[PDB]
Amino acid sequence: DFLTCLTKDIPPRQLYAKSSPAYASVWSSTVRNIKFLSDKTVKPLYIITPTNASHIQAAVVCGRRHGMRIRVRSGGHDYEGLSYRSEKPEPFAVVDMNKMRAVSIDGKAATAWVDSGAQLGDLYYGIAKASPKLGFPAGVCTTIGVGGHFSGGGFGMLLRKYGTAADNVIDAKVVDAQGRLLDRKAMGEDHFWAIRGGGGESFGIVASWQVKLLPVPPKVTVFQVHKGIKEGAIDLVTKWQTVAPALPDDLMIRIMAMGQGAMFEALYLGTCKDLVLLMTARFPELGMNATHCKEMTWIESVPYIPMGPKGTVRDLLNRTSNIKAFGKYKSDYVLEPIPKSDWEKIFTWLVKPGAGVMIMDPYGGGIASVPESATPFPRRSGVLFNIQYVVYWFGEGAAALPTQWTRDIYDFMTPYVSKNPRQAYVNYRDLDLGVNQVVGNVSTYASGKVWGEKYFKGNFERLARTKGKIDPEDYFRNEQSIPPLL
Numbered sequence: 001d002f003l004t005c006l007t008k009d010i011p012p013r014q015l016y017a018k019s020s021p022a023y024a025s026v027w028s029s030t031v032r033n034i035k036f037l038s039d040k041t042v043k044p045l046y047i048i049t050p051t052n053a054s055h056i057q058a059a060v061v062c063g064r065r066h067g068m069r070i071r072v073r074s075g076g077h078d079y080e081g082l083s084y085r086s087e088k089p090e091p092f093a094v095v096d097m098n099k100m101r102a103v104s105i106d107g108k109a110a111t112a113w114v115d116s117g118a119q120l121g122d123l124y125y126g127i128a129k130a131s132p133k134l135g136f137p138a139g140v141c142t143t144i145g146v147g148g149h150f151s152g153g154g155f156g157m158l159l160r161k162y163g164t165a166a167d168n169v170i171d172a173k174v175v176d177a178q179g180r181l182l183d184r185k186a187m188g189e190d191h192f193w194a195i196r197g198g199g200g201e202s203f204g205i206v207a208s209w210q211v212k213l214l215p216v217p218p219k220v221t222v223f224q225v226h227k228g229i230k231e232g233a234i235d236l237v238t239k240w241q242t243v244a245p246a247l248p249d250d251l252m253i254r255i256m257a258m259g260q261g262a263m264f265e266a267l268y269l270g271t272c273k274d275l276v277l278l279m280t281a282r283f284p285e286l287g288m289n290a291t292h293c294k295e296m297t298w299i300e301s302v303p304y305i306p307m308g309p310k311g312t313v314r315d316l317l318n319r320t321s322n323i324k325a326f327g328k329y330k331s332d333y334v335l336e337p338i339p340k341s342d343w344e345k346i347f348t349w350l351v352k353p354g355a356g357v358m359i360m361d362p363y364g365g366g367i368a369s370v371p372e373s374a375t376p377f378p379r380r381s382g383v384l385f386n387i388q389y390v391v392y393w394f395g396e397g398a399a400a401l402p403t404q405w406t407r408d409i410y411d412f413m414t415p416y417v418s419k420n421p422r423q424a425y426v427n428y429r430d431l432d433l434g435v436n437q438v439v440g441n442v443s444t445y446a447s448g449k450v451w452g453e454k455y456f457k458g459n460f461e462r463l464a465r466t467k468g469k470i471d472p473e474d475y476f477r478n479e480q481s482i483p484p485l486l
């Protein structure tokens with residue numbers, strides 16, 4: 001009934017049922033967190049790969065009529081895999097946006113219409129091909145789909161200069177609960193506000209986003225400084241807490257703390273000549289000099305940050321991630337500096353069996369210039385840095401220890417991080433923060449508030465009221481979707 005309704009508008013070769021020969025290949029292709037590549041995983045009954053907006057509209061209308069819910073997938077980077085799976089058995093279809101990957105740049109306006117199914121690498125390469133002096137402030141990882149990324153805000157190495165990806169969105173085309181294709185002018189100001197940081201799924205299927213391409217100099221500078229415990233790593237991380245968020249908006253210094261060492265990784269929007277003087281005046285303790293400097297163009301810095309010197313600009317078009325593993329992730333936000341003595345205690349947790357990495361990104365600058373209520377992303381002024389706890393493993397048999405570590409370090413970090421509410425990042429999805437409760441075919445406000453306030457703070461109420469206007473029947477839902485407030 002649902003399938004026959006789809007064939008009226010969507011070609012059968014773009015439709016995959018569980019019995020289709022290409023089903024397994026199409027489902028598994030973008031499942032990034034391998035712990036979900038199991039038989040226990042609740043898989044969709046149907047997979048739809050649209051190539052036009054009318055196909056998405058048809059899918060929604062067909063879904064309403066035949067009682068089939070839709071979970072949309074772009075790059076599939078969802079940490080908890082909510083774009084391709086369900087926690088409990090329920091009938092659903094997946095709208096896979098991967099074939100809608102157009103990046104159309106308006107050369108004379110420096111704007112771009114980017115499809116949700118395009119990965120960040122497609123966007124980055126597209127901008128580079130059109131101009132050597134233009135860039136865009138999105139994530140580090142090349143395989144992230146624009147759809148889920150922008151929906152949750154999205155940040156990377158350019159956050160201190162230009163904010164989030166969503167801060168630079170000027171228009172968008174969304175398919176709502178009624179199957180209407182709406183732009184900014186047509187969806188209203190609340191609906192447009194909601195998709196710019198309010199998380200994916202909840203407010204409909206965003207087909208494409210119009211973004212503002214921003215300037216970057218012809219040469220940028222990258223440095224990677226590794227520091228062990230005996231070289232003063234604990235002292236350097238302590239000082240960094242106040243120095244990094246206060247540095248000029250052209251400089252971003254991120255930390256990757258693993259085991260016994262702390263890697264200071266940076267991207268400076270300028271040359272080595274100007275960077276050395278800046279570092280010796282603001283953070284001399286790091287021992288940074290011109291030997292650490294790697295000068296290159298902006299586009300060349302994109303594969304350099306996660307793939308090393310081996311990565312090329314052409315590698316950005318590869319749709320397979322360089323990370324092929326089972327993972328558990330959690331996030332925190334620090335508002336007050338953590339004392340040296342306590343950083344010593346945090347570092348002992350990194351040599352514990354099953355330990356992962358702590359990735360720390362400094363805020364301040366351009367990200368902190370936007371008011372807390374301007375976009376649904378509330379981590380602006382007052383935030384010093386974001387912390388991401390990441391663990392990787394092999395096989396479901398070695399899952400017990402690294403999973404326990406993430407929860408263990410999180411419990412320990414409680415007095416040092418943000419409180420009332422304990423702020424978390426939506427794109428760093430964590431179901432341990434709570435899931436929705438469904439009473440009367442609708443997700444409840446009270447259950448949504450638990451995790452909601454963590455991700456969105458005071459912006460949760462407006463997000464819930466907006467959901468009440470667009471989708472009161474709660475058609476677009478998952479375990480962590482915005483509940484309707486009437």
Ligand SMILES: *Cc1cc2c(nc3c(=O)[nH]c(=O)nc-3n2C[C@H](O)[C@H](O)[C@H](O)COP(=O)(O)OP(=O)(O)OC[C@H]2O[C@@H](n3cnc4c(N)ncnc43)[C@H](O)[C@@H]2O)c(*)c1C
Nearest residue numbers: 074075076077078139140141145147148149155200201206
């Ligand atoms: C795996 C991975 C994730 C990363 C990485 N690096 C990041 C970084 O440097 N900065 C960040 O800010 N975030 C980083 N993330 C985290 C997140 O996983 C991503 O930021 C995105 O959430 C992933 O988006 P996408 O790849 O599109 O994932 P999906 O699983 O397809 O979707 C997530 C989510 O949103 C909904 N959704 C998808 N597409 C749409 C559209 N078009 N409209 C509405 N809603 C959409 C899904 O249903 C789901 O709920 C680095 C790595 C390696």
Ligand SMILES: *[C@@H]1O[C@H](CO)[C@@H](O[C@@H]2O[C@H](CO)[C@@H](O)[C@H](O)[C@H]2NC(C)=O)[C@H](O)[C@H]1NC(C)=O
Nearest residue numbers: 009010051052053054055056057058179180181
């Ligand atoms: C691709 O999708 C677009 C958008 O749905 C289709 O164009 C719309 O068609 C409907 C009727 O089906 C009209 O009411 C709208 O006015 C059209 N919108 C615009 C601005 O084009 C388009 O026909 C589809 N193309 C194909 C080949 O299916």
Ligand SMILES: *[C@@H]1O[C@H](CO)[C@@H](O)[C@H](O)[C@H]1NC(C)=O
Nearest residue numbers: 225286287288289290291292
């Ligand atoms: C520059 O830093 C390097 C660290 O790799 C160090 O070996 C070198 O001595 C420094 N330059 C000076 C001042 O000699």
